[PDB]
Amino acid sequence: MKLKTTLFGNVYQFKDVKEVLAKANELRSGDVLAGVAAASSQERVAAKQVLSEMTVADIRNNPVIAYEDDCVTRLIQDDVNETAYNQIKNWSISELREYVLSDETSVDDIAFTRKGLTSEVVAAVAKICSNADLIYGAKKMPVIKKANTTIGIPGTFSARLQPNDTRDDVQSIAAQIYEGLSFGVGDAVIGVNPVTDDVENLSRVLDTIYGVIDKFNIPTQGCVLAHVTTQIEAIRRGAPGGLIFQSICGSEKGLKEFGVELAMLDEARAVGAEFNRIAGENCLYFETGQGSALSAGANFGADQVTMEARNYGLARHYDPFIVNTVVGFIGPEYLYNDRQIIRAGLEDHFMGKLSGISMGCDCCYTNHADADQNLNENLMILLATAGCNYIMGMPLGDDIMLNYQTTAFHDTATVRQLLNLRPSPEFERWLESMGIMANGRLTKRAGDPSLFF
Template identity: 45%
Template sequence: MSVRTRSVQGATYRFDGLVDLLAKATPKRSGDELAGCAASSAAERVAAQWALADEPLMTFLNEEVVPYETDEVTRLIMDQHDADAFAPVASLTVGGLRDWLLEVATRPDASRILRALAPGLTPEMAAAVSKLMSVQDLICVSRAIEVTSAFRTTLGLSGTLATRLQPNHPTDDLAGVSAAILDGLLMGSGDAVVGINPATDSPQAAADLLKLIDDIRQQLAIPIQSCVLTHVTTTIGLIEAGAPVDLPFQSIAGTQKANAGFGVTLDILREADEAARSLHRGTVGDQVMYFETGQGAALSAEGHYGVGGRPVDEQTLEARAYGVARAFDPLLLNTVVGFIGPEYLHDGKQIIRAGLEDNFCGKLLGVPMGVDVCYTNHAEADDDDMDALLTLLGAAGTNYVICVPGTDDIMLGYQSLSFHNALAVRRTLGLRPAPEFEAWLLGMEMADAAGHVLPRDPLGSPLSRLVLGGAA
């Protein structure tokens, strides 16, 4: 374990190994302070960032953050590293990679170059360079990378912003869920997925919800995919029972121990992926997995320790979760950026920075990245912060965001985006829905040729009678 030192303002700071250096170089974060790995001052943070900028990228292939011998996530990351893809940047430092990314982002073929690089970058490299980047840097590079995925809609195309329609209900009442689905569809939401967090762990309740969405989809010929966000093992059972499963879902994290806290291993995820692909339910693609992550997940599971028993910073562990997702070529991945709480991201400033870091790291690693722009009611954040983050993410080319009726998820008890928020940012930034979904909106006379959703009487439309009638 090599020691790095830097002197700032007459004081010399020592960083004991790569784990310590990455943690101290991270912008201020309440979760790192909770874990005891954060910089003790702004001066120490600057010293760490200076030292990190001079760190060769090759270091990340020779010095582990989480031990290879005891962690299957590390083994996955290192065993799948593509040396040929890494070659164009192999001689660079972390600071050199930042400069290279910003220069490449100005080229007309930036997306092709950066997508080719993705298999050569480890998550730790992506996390490291993000710590040296300003908010504007994160946006400029993220916007240059197009990461597409497809099932019944094509997501991630340049100039588009998709949405997950989240019609949660505190009792999984089918009429209540249907009303929320109708609300979202009438405002052009749902092209990423109609995804429900079930209120119970009941496989039968999950099956009933899946059938409800699938009936609506088929009745109205809507190009959407559905997901009930139950545990992946429950979804495997639902597939075996013949339920209309489109996408298996699972929360994942950046270490083996944290994933064990979610009750999953890489082998279980492979089983789910293979089971869902075997159904061949996609029409324009066959990517089936849906993953959620969030900075602080590993810390909350006591799975945040790395080499030498040192705590690893939450943003590096978050990027490692994207390394897990990348191995499964998913349709969707989103960070629930403010959902875990102020213990991990204290206020609006930290949430905004984290959301842009997550979007950057995910896209740089080749993952189809989305963000749940959200906060809990006890965080030092409000809707103005979320409006700012949404607009910045729209500029940064995030694949999709999550929307709920009126911003308030009454089942999960947190604040997200509304369907109106997505409409506003699409119009403001000239973004459109996924092309297959936009064609459906046009065919239903619910949008104009520019992709703008048209106002409709929610109770008088044929769509309302079909959706609500089916749930009656």
């Protein structure tokens, strides 16, 4: 396998695969802060070409973190279908990209092919894709899951109700839930980022969420996005179980940073099967995002694109109901501006769909990054056309608690009516009986939370 190429008469040589995976990336401030970024456009291009010419086996047999040392490498390599892998092992990344993009490749063809990839292979393809490549490639890879609603069917668009209060006051939380339901938000989940981490608080938050759910017989599910070990305990203890959440990183040391062992995730799966109020088979919820391993010092010289891909290959093992990157959640040290928050939100979603997970995206940015709310509206629409399974919702996307801006409840309603998409069919059926939605559009009386009173 070449690690070198000649571009304009000058020879471009690279040390290993990890470096070729890194410099091929589009320019972001994260790979600069990590020392893995290319020196220029030419060596970036040179890295893509050497990367495009490496085979699947080249990248599958060269994980950024070795097998014996990282239990996420272990999990990814162990879940490979070696039969699907051996069919494709000698394809160059440049033929895998053209196979994924081909209109002669079916959803069922991809369903077997993706079984023979490893997360690093997913990242490779994403690296040599234009932004239209990432959108159109992901669109032809739908991932459908079911809980108490069905998410991911082409022609639908879900949204998660994010009602975060600076005190987890249950009136502030209630109030935004009534606001969101009135715009058609909440079919992905009504999910709460808690300001605390105590059991008696979640039960309070869950019993508030589920009081509304039970009162209006809402087809959906609740969540409070505390640590998984507190969630498990609050539900083993009598709080209503919907989804079970946990943030994840793409390395063992990254999971330890969060306090997470893979045994905790197995336990969440088993707690869900005995306790949770879920009709479907998918009940887990993970969140990801470029720059978490680099923050944790758990990236090991690998770039935030490849490490983010290991997130999805990890998630795919637990078959969660939903996954979403939080694209601009941390700040400009990993992704600086609009150009990079878009490109990464396209890379992420594409990577998640190729790994076979119900990939949404929190289209968002922070106030110390070079961005504004027009960036959220650009990205949500592009990701919608890519068939992104869900985005977030908050009143004007203003998180009074986590101090970032996400997408409004207006913005899901806009995408659905701009692109003629519907909610989860079950959630849509409920909104129609409540008079909030007719023919995928808001009624006149919609957007008014006092409707529930």
